[PDB]
Amino acid sequence: RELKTVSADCKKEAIEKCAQWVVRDCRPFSAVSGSGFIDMIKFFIKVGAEYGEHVNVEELLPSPITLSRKVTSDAKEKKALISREIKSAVEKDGASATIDLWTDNYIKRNFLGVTLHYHENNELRDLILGLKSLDFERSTAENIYKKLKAIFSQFNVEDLSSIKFVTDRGANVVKSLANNIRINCSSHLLSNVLENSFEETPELNMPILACKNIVKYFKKANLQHRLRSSLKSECPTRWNSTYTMLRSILDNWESVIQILSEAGETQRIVHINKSIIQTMVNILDGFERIFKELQTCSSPSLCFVVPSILKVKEICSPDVGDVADIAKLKVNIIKNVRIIWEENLSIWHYTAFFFYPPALHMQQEKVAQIKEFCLSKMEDLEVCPSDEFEFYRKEIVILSEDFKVMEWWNLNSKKYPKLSKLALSLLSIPASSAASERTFSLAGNIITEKRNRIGQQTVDSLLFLNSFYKNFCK
Amino acid sequence: RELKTVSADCKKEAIEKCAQWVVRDCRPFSAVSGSGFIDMIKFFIKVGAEYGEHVNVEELLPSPITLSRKVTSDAKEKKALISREIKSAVEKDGASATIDLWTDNYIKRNFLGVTLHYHENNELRDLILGLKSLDFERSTAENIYKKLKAIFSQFNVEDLSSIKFVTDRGANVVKSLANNIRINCSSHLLSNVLENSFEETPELNMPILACKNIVKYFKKANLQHRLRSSLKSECPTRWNSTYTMLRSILDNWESVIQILSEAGETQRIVHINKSIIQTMVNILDGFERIFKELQTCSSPSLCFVVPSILKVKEICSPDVGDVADIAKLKVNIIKNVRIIWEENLSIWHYTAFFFYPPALHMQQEKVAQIKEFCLSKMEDLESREPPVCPSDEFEFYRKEIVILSEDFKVMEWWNLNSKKYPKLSKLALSLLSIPASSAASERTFSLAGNIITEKRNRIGQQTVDSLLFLNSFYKNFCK
DNA sequence: AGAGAACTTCAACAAGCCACAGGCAAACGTAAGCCACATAGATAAG
DNA sequence: AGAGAACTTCAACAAGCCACAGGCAAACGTAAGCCACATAGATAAG
């Protein structure tokens, strides 16, 4: 049970040996820090101890094809083994899910994201079922649902309407998912509404044009080396694409203004206002933290919806320090939010926020709809229920910086039989498909020019095993 | 020398746990196949036996920055230890170096490439020295000269008369190299000649874009799934893409014609005469074999370009069934050869081809010029039918007749001919160590691309330079 | 030339106690300056 | 009462020889997948 520290001589031998390895095989440096690699260290040490130093190492080495075959097989056995746990989680309505479709840049396959979210014990579950490519049939949503049910049948799950789905507004996706409770992706809604608000205000375009010319010059003239922070592009696919350029402008301000002064580019900066930049940064920092709080995986994010409304309507409300253009922007933002966000928000969002222990947030008319939905869900999952609802109205809870609604409800689960189960059912719902596009990002990470011959089954096997190893290993 | 065996259960758990690691680490399956991999495994097994089982790993395994420090230290140690042998190679007049420029695609740095080749003992050493940054200077021949002097003085080299260069016709390239040896790149010149040949024949202009649009239609519309040898686009930055794409289209002709029949787009393929395609492939087969001949490094390639001139003039000889368009193409190709190839040739290639044991092939003024050049060099490097003298060495080598054996390698032939012709053999080992073109530079760039990656940004230039140098050293001095 | 066997007579060593003080000899204290590997932050690709 | 010391007799009895029955782990030929490595080969990119 006690590790035996060795003399530094074997240590130096290890250092030189691994330097030779890293140079010869030409691998990224951090691969030594891989925890699985450290497990390899333990395994080879023990086999050396139990067989000596006069062994045949080579015959113990398998072939990579056998590696791939064993990977796919073990994927099959482990997915079969966890099918039972997933079915148990689904039956009690404890599970939610998000989906999307992904494409690479080499073969352009129609890969679909299948992620299942729920909660077990005191760890918030979040599972990636598998990325199955649709192949090439006109990318029809009919084939999408066919392959979807093929995926679900791999775990013996044939019911979907009870699963709560948080997805964006893809036409075919929403068309097919109208049979399911469709929740708009809060992050995607924020990005789209922000883009709509920006496109309604040309009064920022002229400094935007100047900044775009600045960044083009920076990526062209090759002068980023003397900034300590290289300028970034927009990349509209990137979330909060304006925030990154606002940062790379305001933060680098001193160095960039000095180098444009010393490079004879005073023309590039005569059309820029600092006050507007600082006001917009002060407005957009809240938006960035809304993004990060709505992209939380190991924490519930559906309870953020109405506090997000409060924070936005406080931020978007006109102030004294705004310009006429900025006040016009704020009015446009108010119009867009009232026609999109609150228009599309519905009973699920307010009800999921309601279970937060300070239930005095929405003392307005929304309590009626929230109570009706709570009664319906109590029937679905079924001290009395309405008595529970009334006694919850008697509860007052003080916020603390480390307070969690989940632990609070579970410690009140001893007092409340089924409303706590309702809370965990609602708390297991992220407010966005951030996990879905992160799965897409991971798939992009595993794909590369040298990896253009991979098979789809191998890919979804790898990602499922990675998710299982992340979530159910202690 | 006997080796032992483990239980099958041990092998099974090895499979299980290595799969666990690789799925956790998300690494390509080629990693286990590495030779350094099994080297480290053997070291681990030896240490585990020597130390037991309840031996800690966490303390033993170092930190990545420690690794970078140790790699730089080992690189500089090998630099110091090998600079002396490399200097001996420098003044043994058998050294060949590569020079080029390359820009990154993430940070867009400017890098000057220097490597070195030499022959010692029964092996041709191929060492990649360094791809050093030019910082952000004006990128002139002065910065290039400073960088190359710094590169070589890092290995205690200050004179560059003996070194022999092969490179392209860049502006700075022709600007700086006027003071030392210069040879034009065979690959760059060959690609330029192919582009000229296809440009000067107007009749074959439209099939190029026709085939490119065919590939584009089969690409963008997700039309590559049922194609056995799927088509790909040009990527003209590469070498002879057009012929390879045409070959692939000719290969898949059956699939594509039935696909057009089933899809009602037969008008896409009916616009091209197939006989044109067979004519193109029949002409270009010898060209592609020449392509594959010139790229050799572990075997000589400088000397195998004039016999490629022989092969071209054999191919460029007029045919009977060649269309008038094909006759125009071949006449234009002959003109391009006359105006480019012999224009860019130097005495290096003639001297390299001369050492072919049946020297009777080039019995012209060429061998006389080669004799004068070799006599000058040997007077610098130092009828009597015994070798005795360099002039008599050439006189005796002239009359030699050797069979065209199929498995003939001139390397060991001259190695055992050094007993007969010592100084001429030294000239041979000097000449053969020169690749004809700069394909090694692109190989080094490919290695860099294996190093530099979208996720592998933000690496110091000295670090990567040491990595590539040490890797080349190991591929030079490890048995 | 035996042979066993016990006896005074010197008188002659000798193992067996102490007294004790003088090493060299194993092992524990500071100190100690070169390392040098371990510990937290920006930062580009995303 | 006792001495200490050699013969004399059955004697039986616990050491070694012997070696046909009954028994057993060890060795060998066979056969069924079998199945996990091992081979080239191609296929894209670079």
Residue numbers in the entry:
A (entry chain C): 81 to 462, 518 to 609
B (entry chain D): 81 to 462, 513 to 609
Publication passage describing the model:
The Hermes DNA transposon is a member of the eukaryotic hAT superfamily, and its transposase forms a ring-shaped tetramer of dimers. The Hermes transposase is composed of 612 amino acids and is organized in four domains. Architecturally, the Hermes transposase is unusual as it spontaneously forms a ring-shaped tetramer of dimers. All hAT transposases are predicted to contain an N-terminal BED zinc-finger domain organized around a conserved CCHH or CCHC motif that coordinates Zn2+13, but no structural information is available for Hermes as the constructs used in previous structural work lacked the first 78 amino acids.
As we were unable to generate interpretable cryo-EM data for a single Hermes assembly that bound one LE and RE transposon end at the same time, we determined the structure of the transpososome bound to two REs. In marked contrast to the LE-LE transpososome, none of the refined 3D classes showed density corresponding to either free or bound BED domains. The 3’-ends of 8 + RE-TIR + 30 DNAs were both inserted in the C1/C2 dimer in a TIR-like fashion, suggesting that this interaction was not a function of STR/BED interactions, but a possible consequence of the particular length of the DNA used. The cryo-EM structure of the core of the RE-RE transpososome showed that the RE does not interact with any BED domain, suggesting that RE binding relies on the interaction of its TIR with one dimer in the octamer, perhaps aided by nonspecific contributions from dimer C across the octamer.
